[PDB]
Design a protein around this ligand. Sequence first.
Ligand SMILES: CCC(=O)Nc1ccc2[nH]c(=O)n(C3CCN(Cc4ccc(-c5nc(Cc6ccc(O)cc6)c(=O)[nH]c5-c5ccccc5)cc4)CC3)c2c1
Length: 382
Amino acid sequence: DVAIVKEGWLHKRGEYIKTWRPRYFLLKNDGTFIGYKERPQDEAPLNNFSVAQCQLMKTERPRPNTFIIRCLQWTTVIERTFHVETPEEREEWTTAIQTVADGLKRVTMNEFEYLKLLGKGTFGKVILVKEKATGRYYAMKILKKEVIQNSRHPFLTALKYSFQTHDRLCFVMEYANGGELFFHLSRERVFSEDRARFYGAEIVSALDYLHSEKNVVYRDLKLENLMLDKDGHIKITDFGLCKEGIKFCGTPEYLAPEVLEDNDYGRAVDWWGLGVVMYEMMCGRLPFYNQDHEKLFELILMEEIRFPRTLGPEAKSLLSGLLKKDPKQRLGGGSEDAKEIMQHRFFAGIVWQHVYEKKLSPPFKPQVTSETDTRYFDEEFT
Ligand SMILES: CCC(=O)Nc1ccc2[nH]c(=O)n(C3CCN(Cc4ccc(-c5nc(Cc6ccc(O)cc6)c(=O)[nH]c5-c5ccccc5)cc4)CC3)c2c1
């Protein structure tokens, strides 16, 4: 009952590298729109690729015969722009996408206090706010309404409120007050293997939820998106906004190779990101680094990662498997997904139900009195 509707070659604009590339795309009954570097020989459906509840737009800028699939996924607006040689191909491409999309078919702003602008994007901004009545701290995604339920896990930032105005759509999210993780790692230079095991285990727990329960790739696992709460447990943030890049988008040193090549990607992307995160916690440096992006791309794509002699054998086996450049060969790329990492020797002795229930002791208790303490918001944040 799941079958291809339309397939063929498209010109896809790279999501992080804004260059046009030829990709073979498949439009399926389940609504999945996946592009491949070569024709697929022919895995569970990922929501990242679905065209359900997305809007289609045809345009002649930046280049003619372009169509844009615009989706709201959770609280982030994402775009995928494609280009065919003739307007006829576009029209029959868009209608098929529109066919499958249709075929598969009191809180106000004054209650908060504006504090600090966290980020600007194409379709809105993110702002650190404080709820006046409670004094708690929240991030508010304010999205332009012209352009357009919570599911809780211990280590994901909760979407607390959702409201809209005449022209805005607002998502209020819990903001942890235990400090950014890049701040704690910088102050302590390197984390112990046990400290990184605690942090890694909680991330693996949340990644399993998103992969199996939610059927989505997080695709943005990096140190800057990790925070600690008042107790010292991990919260994976969701404060991202789709920006049109600078003259390329984002910081490429974290990107999985299959994403860097705009190739087909799956749940294995987050395990690469897990490898990058835990490599830096246990080594104190990023695995790949060079100022030239041409070299950095080649580094991430070609140069195999090197380890310091300070790391133990269990750590080196985990990092090597997570940072395998082939996602089919990568630790966590099989059907068992998160189970491959949970069953790894580095996580021996870890009872995984205990991790979900926050039974493991945080090795680092942040110096905060309560959930309203603003120590890591003050100018001691240096
Ligand atoms: C260069 C700058 C730029 O523009 N970069 C860029 C370019 C192209 C992009 N293309 C993209 O996608 N991104 C982003 C889109 C957003 N993610 C992050 C992300 C992924 C899943 C979720 C997410 N999700 C569902 C459930 C869910 C619901 C609906 C759905 O469709 C899928 C899942 C859910 O319950 N909790 C979460 C969640 C909530 C809190 C904390 C953690 C997870 C929340 C956030 C990262 C990749 C792009 C980014």
